[PDB]
Structure formats: structure tokens, C-alpha cells
């Protein structure tokens with residue numbers, strides 16, 4: 001549900017986000033929104049930060065996502081995830 005033009009947007013992650021990404025392998029300083037979310041999901045899957053049916057993202061105060069009235073995300077609310085992300089980076 002997010003335009004391709006917008007999935008292409010090249011961005012630069014702030015320290016907190018960049019650190020999460022690198023923890024999962026990322027090597028660059030800049031990425032496309034698509035790449036950022038891709039690495040975000042990889043973290044989520046590797047840390048199993050999700051509900052039983054993998055329908056909702058569930059994280060803790062102890063993980064890197066928590067660090068990133070706590071926000072709860074559903075895996076299908078694309079827009080909302082993008083918005084939060086937009087706070088953790090600066091466009092290029």
C-alpha cells in the first residue's frame with residue numbers, strides 16, 4: 001500500500017535506527033526506504049518480536065526496537081510503520 005516512488009526514496013538513518021540495522025548486517029550509511037524496512041523485519045524475525053500468528057509486532061523495553069505510551073504495530077499497517085520510520089532518519 002505504499003507507492004513505489006516512496007519505497008525508492010533514498011534516506012539516511014539516525015544513530016538509533018542505524019545501530020539496529022547494522023546489528024543485522026547492514027553496512028551502508030544511506031538506504032532506500034525499502035531497504036530500511038527490509039532490515040527492520042530481519043531484526044524482528046531474528047528476535048521473534050511478534051505475536052503467535054506473526055500478525056503483530058511485539059517488542060520489549062530490552063531490545064533495540066524498544067530503544068528506537070509505547071506504540072503497537074500490526075504487520076499490515078504499512079503507512080503507520082513508514083511514519084514512525086520517517087522520524088528516525090533524514091532524507092537524502
Ligand SMILES: C/C=C/[C@H](C(=O)O)N1C(=O)[C@H](Cc2ccc(F)cc2)O[C@@H](c2ccc(Cl)cc2)[C@H]1c1ccc(Cl)cc1
Pocket residue numbers: 037038039040041042044045050054055056057073075077078079081082
Ligand atoms: C512497512 C514495510 C513492510 C515490509 C513488507 O511487508 O514488504 N516488510 C519487509 O520488507 C521485511 C522483509 C523480511 C521478511 C522476513 C525476513 F526474515 C526478513 C525480511 O519484513 C517484513 C515482516 C513481515 C512480518 C513480520 Cl512478523 C516481520 C517482518 C515487513 C515488515 C518490516 C518491518 C516492519 Cl515494522 C513491519 C513489516
